[PDB]
Scaffold this active site. Structure first.
Site, PDB file in Angstrom:
ATOM      1  N   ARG A   1       0.912  -1.117   0.014  1.00  0.00           N
ATOM      2  CA  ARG A   1      -0.094   0.163  -0.077  1.00  0.00           C
ATOM      3  C   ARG A   1       0.890   1.189   0.100  1.00  0.00           C
ATOM      4  O   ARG A   1       0.521   2.392  -0.504  1.00  0.00           O
ATOM      5  CB  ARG A   1      -0.859   0.141   1.379  1.00  0.00           C
ATOM      6  CG  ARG A   1      -2.165  -1.166   1.290  1.00  0.00           C
ATOM      7  CD  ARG A   1      -3.031  -0.783   2.330  1.00  0.00           C
ATOM      8  NE  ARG A   1      -2.415  -1.176   3.353  1.00  0.00           N
ATOM      9  CZ  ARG A   1      -2.712  -2.225   4.411  1.00  0.00           C
ATOM     10  NH1 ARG A   1      -3.470  -3.225   3.784  1.00  0.00           N
ATOM     11  NH2 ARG A   1      -1.972  -2.475   5.360  1.00  0.00           N
TER      12      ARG A   1
ATOM     13  N   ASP B   1     -16.838  -3.203  -3.635  1.00  0.00           N
ATOM     14  CA  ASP B   1     -16.926  -4.513  -2.759  1.00  0.00           C
ATOM     15  C   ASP B   1     -18.115  -4.979  -2.457  1.00  0.00           C
ATOM     16  O   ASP B   1     -19.172  -4.115  -2.659  1.00  0.00           O
ATOM     17  CB  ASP B   1     -16.195  -3.783  -1.266  1.00  0.00           C
ATOM     18  CG  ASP B   1     -15.684  -5.097  -0.575  1.00  0.00           C
ATOM     19  OD1 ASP B   1     -16.439  -5.675   0.193  1.00  0.00           O
ATOM     20  OD2 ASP B   1     -14.430  -5.308  -0.668  1.00  0.00           O
TER      21      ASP B   1
ATOM     22  N   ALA C   1     -17.671  -7.503  -8.428  1.00  0.00           N
ATOM     23  CA  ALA C   1     -16.311  -7.307  -9.005  1.00  0.00           C
ATOM     24  C   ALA C   1     -16.592  -7.321 -10.652  1.00  0.00           C
ATOM     25  O   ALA C   1     -16.371  -6.261 -11.336  1.00  0.00           O
ATOM     26  CB  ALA C   1     -14.982  -8.034  -8.726  1.00  0.00           C
TER      27      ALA C   1
ATOM     28  N   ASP D   1      -7.143  -7.005  -6.114  1.00  0.00           N
ATOM     29  CA  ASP D   1      -6.721  -7.441  -4.718  1.00  0.00           C
ATOM     30  C   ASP D   1      -7.807  -8.595  -4.272  1.00  0.00           C
ATOM     31  O   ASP D   1      -8.469  -8.577  -3.521  1.00  0.00           O
ATOM     32  CB  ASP D   1      -6.475  -6.819  -3.347  1.00  0.00           C
ATOM     33  CG  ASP D   1      -6.013  -7.356  -2.278  1.00  0.00           C
ATOM     34  OD1 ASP D   1      -5.509  -8.271  -2.309  1.00  0.00           O
ATOM     35  OD2 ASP D   1      -6.741  -7.029  -1.380  1.00  0.00           O
TER      36      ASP D   1
ATOM     37  N   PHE E   1     -11.473  -4.718  -5.417  1.00  0.00           N
ATOM     38  CA  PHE E   1     -11.860  -5.309  -4.160  1.00  0.00           C
ATOM     39  C   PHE E   1     -11.356  -4.530  -2.942  1.00  0.00           C
ATOM     40  O   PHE E   1     -10.408  -4.644  -2.451  1.00  0.00           O
ATOM     41  CB  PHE E   1     -11.259  -6.807  -4.237  1.00  0.00           C
ATOM     42  CG  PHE E   1     -11.524  -7.568  -5.389  1.00  0.00           C
ATOM     43  CD1 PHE E   1     -10.790  -7.550  -6.514  1.00  0.00           C
ATOM     44  CD2 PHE E   1     -12.684  -8.408  -5.223  1.00  0.00           C
ATOM     45  CE1 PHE E   1     -11.165  -8.303  -7.457  1.00  0.00           C
ATOM     46  CE2 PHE E   1     -12.876  -9.407  -6.456  1.00  0.00           C
ATOM     47  CZ  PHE E   1     -12.161  -9.316  -7.603  1.00  0.00           C
TER      48      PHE E   1
ATOM     49  N   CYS F   1      -3.385 -14.013  -2.872  1.00  0.00           N
ATOM     50  CA  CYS F   1      -3.182 -14.586  -1.277  1.00  0.00           C
ATOM     51  C   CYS F   1      -3.484 -15.876  -1.355  1.00  0.00           C
ATOM     52  O   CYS F   1      -3.469 -16.261  -0.455  1.00  0.00           O
ATOM     53  CB  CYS F   1      -3.727 -13.669  -0.598  1.00  0.00           C
ATOM     54  SG  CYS F   1      -5.718 -13.749  -0.723  1.00  0.00           S
TER      55      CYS F   1
END
Lengths: 396, 396
Positions: B208, B247, B276, B296, B225, B336
């Site tokens: 970030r 979101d 999204a 993300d 997101f 992730c």
């Protein structure tokens, strides 16, 4: 104009963004071709794929310059691309005065590399086709970047020789200047065009700057392949209490000492001329431990065929380096071998850590060459540097 | 104490630094074992290898806590490790008031995660073994870090329901406090321990912060997101003229709006509660282009066998995101999913770029989770976040 017909695999690759035709993808050639000629590329079906520089004697038979049939390849095309490349560094990357201006295919200028060191630009050409436009390129550089008053031809190196081009070093255009003092962060470095072992590589810019935050007052630092002092100087100006730099070249060490003086840090630096392994062993036997150890060896792998032996070389260097790092210290290790991918480099470090009985934790992301040496996702060959910053802890 | 006997391969791994025993590597078990029980690990020959938490209902039978037979697993041992973990963030990483204090195995505390938000420490336990020491760990945290005045137990979610542990949310020790305002660079964020849509994840901290330098005044940014607004807020304060954050959670957006107010950037942002893909299709239809698009997405891959479908989902999201980036724009994309390694992620991005007809250049190194979520070289499972900052150019 000669026509190079390529196979399905070759055409498919170009369709996905590839800008090169490998010898293995050539079905046949229509018309005579000599190294450096501009030729057109076609599929077996007669579909135009692009136009570019040819070299029938190279693994890379054609370096595509334009995919537009009507676009003429001349000084104006290169000048527009050089301007675009320069603007990328100044407006996007926000670099000033010192940066790699052109990085071959990544900037759509195959075979051309241009580095800017304040008012001096160094030029390197590794394509016979691009060599024909050498002077036009030199003129274009000074036309798009008025900050440049000298274009120095540094046409030497593996790439240059691989293409079979003669090695040439000389002021090509502009004022007869060959030495300048560049600023990288708070550090200053002497850059001289004439000769070797008296230079400064720009690809490690971001990594050298990244080292500073890790240096703490009272720190003892070791730079195993210091060259002209890049990482060593940054560590000293960052506040390191003692920095030891080792390099095989006497000329590189002489410049390193000059850089230390320029930065007012000669008192805290000790430069040794000698072999890495012998010097590290001397330090090891002395029970010497450093807060930070930096390993930036020469590319051990020049050919994919030399991977096994090369990786063993890296293993041995890293194992020795790890044993000189104090518990809770930092190991900075890099590889510039294009054929060694990140995963291989990583597996090798894990092996060294295991043998030395040490846990290793990442302190920085997986670092690379500075962004002025752009890594093109569509062209693996643009990427060659890997850099890791690791926290070292004895497994006990 | 029950004993788990392992094979030559499993023992060899442990000797190299492994801290786990796969159920598949167990040749036999001596004595009754219940989830969370502390057991000893031995080789077929009778040599002690370690001691740790057992789980007879997992692919990972034992989480090794100590390799010293004399070391007792109790509050004192954990207090020692929690202190070491905390000092790592404060002294090595130089974090001050907000950081992940303990990251399970990376800090030799398998099953425990502790996040520090100023004077509030959020605790999460994912193993039955560690759960038995929950209050001892809470006391230890406040004992080694006087800066913590409240230990909040956030034991809810899939990570908690994974090992069949009871879901619990409450102040475990200290002052009854739930909310605090944290500072990340020049941005402020509201963090409330209650619920799941008024939080903030610390793993993306460095990424970030890295976004700031790429924002140009007047920029239009899309955060697909956005969750509570992490990236969106940093882009707005950095000078973006308009930031659109999407979101699926109405609550997350309410928090994002409160964060925007806190940073004085409410007039630069537009929040959308929705899907999204559906929202990106709407933008695509209007031919909307952005200077920066941030992707993300949630962990699409949860099992090695679910790579095909999961990677296809990433491809679709990245293809859609790429088509929204203006020529000369930037795409920030991450994953992730632990099961997707860097090379797989890269290949997927390369495929998306080829389909969208875009050349992609890297602007940053291969970014990862913040260093307070230590990536242990000897434990692949500790690494899960991959993040790339790419410069986008139309091929045609």
């Amino acid at each position: 104009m000669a026509r190079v017909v390529v196979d399905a695999q070759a055409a498919r690759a170009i369709g996905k963004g590839a800008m090169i035709v490998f010898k293995k993808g050539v079905v046949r050639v229509e018309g005579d071709i000599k190294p450096g000629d501009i030729v057109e590329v076609y599929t077996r079906g007669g579909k135009f794929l692009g136009k570019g520089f040819a070299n029938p004697n190279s693994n890379i038979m054609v370096r595509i310059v334009t995919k537009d049939k009507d676009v003429e390849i001349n000084k104006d095309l290169f000048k527009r691309r050089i301007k675009k490349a320069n603007e990328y560094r100044k407006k996007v990357l926000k670099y000033t005065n010192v940066y790699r201006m052109v990085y071959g295919e990544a900037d759509y200028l195959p075979g051309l590399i241009v580095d800017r060191f304040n008012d001096i630009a160094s030029l390197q050409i590794s394509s016979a086709g691009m060599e024909r436009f050498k002077l036009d390129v030199a003129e274009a550089i000074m036309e798009v970047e008025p900050g440049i008053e000298t274009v120095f031809e540094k046409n030497t190196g593996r790439s240059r020789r691989r293409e079979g081009l003669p090695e040439i070093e000389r002021v090509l255009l502009g004022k007869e200047k060959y030495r300048t003092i560049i600023q990288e962060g708070r550090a200053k470095f002497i850059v001289d065009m004439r000769g070797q072992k008296t230079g400064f590589f720009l690809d490690q810019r971001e990594n050298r700057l990244a080292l500073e935050k890790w240096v703490q007052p009272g720190d003892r630092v070791l730079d195993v392949f210091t060259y002209t002092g890049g990482f060593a100087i940054h560590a000293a100006i960052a506040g390191a209490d003692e920095v030891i730099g080792i390099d095989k070249s006497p000329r590189a060490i002489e410049t390193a000492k000059e850089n230390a003086k320029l930065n007012g840090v000669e008192d805290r630096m000790k430069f040794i001329v000698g072999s890495a392994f012998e010097e590290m062993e001397k330090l090891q036997k002395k029970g010497e431990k450093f807060d930070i150890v930096v390993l930036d060896p020469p590319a051990f792998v020049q050919h994919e065929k030399d991977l096994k032996a090369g990786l063993r070389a890296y293993f041995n260097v890293n194992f020795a380096g790890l044993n000189l790092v104090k518990d809770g210290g930092i190991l900075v290790t890099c590889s510039c071998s294009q054929h060694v991918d990140l995963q291989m480099f990583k597996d090798m470090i894990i092996a060294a850590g295991a043998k030395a009985g040490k846990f290793l934790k990442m302190l920085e992301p997986y670092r690379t060459q500075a962004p002025d040496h752009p890594i093109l996702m569509a062209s693996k060959d643009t990427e060659y540097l890997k850099c890791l910053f690791l926290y070292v802890e004895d497994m006990r």
